[PDB]
Amino acid sequence: TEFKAGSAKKGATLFKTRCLQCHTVEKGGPHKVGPNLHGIFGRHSGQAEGYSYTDANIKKNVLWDENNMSEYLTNPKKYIPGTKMAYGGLKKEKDRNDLITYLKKATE
Amino acid sequence: TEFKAGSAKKGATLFKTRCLQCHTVEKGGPHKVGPNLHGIFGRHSGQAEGYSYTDANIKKNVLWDENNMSEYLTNPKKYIPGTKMAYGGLKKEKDRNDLITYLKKATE
Numbered sequence A, B: 001t002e003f004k005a006g007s008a009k010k011g012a013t014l015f016k017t018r019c020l021q022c023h024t025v026e027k028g029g030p031h032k033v034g035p036n037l038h039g040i041f042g043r044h045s046g047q048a049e050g051y052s053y054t055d056a057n058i059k060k061n062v063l064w065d066e067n068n069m070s071e072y073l074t075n076p077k078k079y080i081p082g083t084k085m086a087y088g089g090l091k092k093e094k095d096r097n098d099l100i101t102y103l104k105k106a107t108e
């Protein structure tokens, strides 16, 4: 417990504004710059099929739960150096909380 | 120009999360703790009828445009000392920008 639920409403707009450029969340949604994130929670990193991940992601072999996801979202490259995800990150815990609350929900 | 348009999507969720407790935006929406804000832009402060404003608001006699609104939103009491609006404020310009973009739009 180092993650606490935030707004899904608010989570959804941080997603549209900071993640939608490269990712989809819907089941049957396509890979774009980044992979479709449907069902990511509980999945290891680099396993969406038909997506060309970097050696770094695959290797990090991250098991995604709201907690892992929060550290990563703080600073992706610092978390999986070599990842091709080009997003600086979400420095505020409160934002991370709202977005994860949104993802926890829309990736199911 | 010391105000620039932001996300309405994002503006709408800051509103639900930080302003909805006391205000409505829709035409025909009711006064709650705070007055209904439909049509506020271009209106002076303390003029919604059927609302009991403080002597301070009425007196400040603020003409509301996206700019005034931004200063106020930073620190209400510092802006209209004596106001009964009990909201600390929105310190980040970027947030202020998204919410005003939302209000500019939903209060029309």
Ligand code: HEC
Residues within 6 Å of the ligand: A015, A018, A019, A020, A021, A022, A023, A033, A034, A035, A037, A040, A044, A045, A046, A047, A048, A052, A053, A054, A055, A056, A057, A082, A083, A084, A085, A086, A087, A090
């Ligand atoms: C494009 C500029 C991106 C933005 C903005 C965001 N992401 Fe991303 N993401 C992107 C790429 C290219 C990749 C793969 C990197 C690689 O090394 O292969 C990723 C990866 C993810 C992952 C890991 C998924 C997995 O299946 O292991 C997650 C969980 C993820 N991205 C989430 C995510 C969120 C929530 C974003 C907005 C804050 C976001 N990313 C931005 C590309 C881009």
Ligand code: HEC
Residues within 6 Å of the ligand: B015, B018, B019, B020, B021, B022, B023, B033, B034, B035, B037, B040, B044, B045, B046, B047, B048, B052, B053, B054, B055, B056, B057, B082, B083, B084, B085, B086, B087, B090
């Ligand atoms: C309740 C705890 C409130 C919250 C949260 C917000 N507002 Fe408010 N607002 C509230 C009151 C009691 C009043 C009247 C104060 C008085 O002295 O009479 C106000 C007033 C406004 C105004 C001025 C309206 C006018 O017609 O002159 C505006 C523009 C306004 N409030 C906006 C607003 C926004 C955008 C908020 C969320 C960030 C918000 N307020 C929070 C009560 C409460």
